[PDB]
Amino acid sequence: SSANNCTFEYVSQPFLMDLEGKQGNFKNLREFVFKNIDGYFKIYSKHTPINLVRDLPQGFSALEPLVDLPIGINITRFQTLLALHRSYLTPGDSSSGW
Amino acid sequence: LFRKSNLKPFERDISTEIYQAGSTPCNGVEGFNCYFPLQSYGFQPTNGV
Numbered sequence: 445s446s447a448n449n450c451t452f453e454y455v456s457q458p459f460l461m462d463l464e465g466k467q468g469n470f471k472n473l474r475e476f477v478f479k480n481i482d483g484y485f486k487i488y489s490k491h492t493p494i495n496l497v498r499d500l501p502q503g504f505s506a507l508e509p510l511v512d513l514p515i516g517i518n519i520t521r522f523q524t525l526l527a528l529h530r531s532y533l534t535p536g537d538s539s540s541g542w
Numbered sequence: 543l544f545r546k547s548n549l550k551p552f553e554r555d556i557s558t559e560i561y562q563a564g565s566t567p568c569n570g571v572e573g574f575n576c577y578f579p580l581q582s583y584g585f586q587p588t589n590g591v
Contacts, residue, residue: 483552516553 454513469497477507478522485515543581 477488489510494501529538536542544561557579560568564575 483550514552518550518553 452513452515454511470494473501475507480515480519483514483516485513485519487511487513543577543579 471493472491473494474491475489479486486509488507490505490507492505528542530536530542534541544563545555546561549555558570559579560570560576561579562568563577564573566573566576568576
């Protein structure tokens with residue numbers, strides 16, 4: 445909703461989508477750890493399949509680094525991004541209903 | 543100019559608001575020692591070393 449006013453860009457575009465909207469027991473778990481040293485924002489990433497449906501599966505795993513960025517900016521807040529819109533069937537609009 | 547604290551290494555201070563000197567809430571304006579936050583070097587061409 446605002447202007448670009450940006451300087452940094454790092455994008456890799458192998459394009460495919462396999463969302464497969466389902467209500468079944470969860471078998472896919474992503475995990476991302478975000479931190480920074482000296483300004484070098486480091487983001488470690490991992491993914492794994494599980495079996496449980498509702499709670500968090502308790503076992504043990506490991507995480508590894510996936511990306512680094514020289515952001516050089518003070519960071520205090522963060523908010524996640526969700527995306528969901530329904531067909532014509534839902535009378536509640538995108539912002540309204542889903 | 544004269545950021546109220548010290549900096550974290552390798553960071554950019556992108557600010558416009560006027561730094562409060564002399565305890566002055568300023569709307570980007572002057573007052574009792576309310577000096578502009580930015581400063582431009584007065585490098586007169588062919589100056590002293």
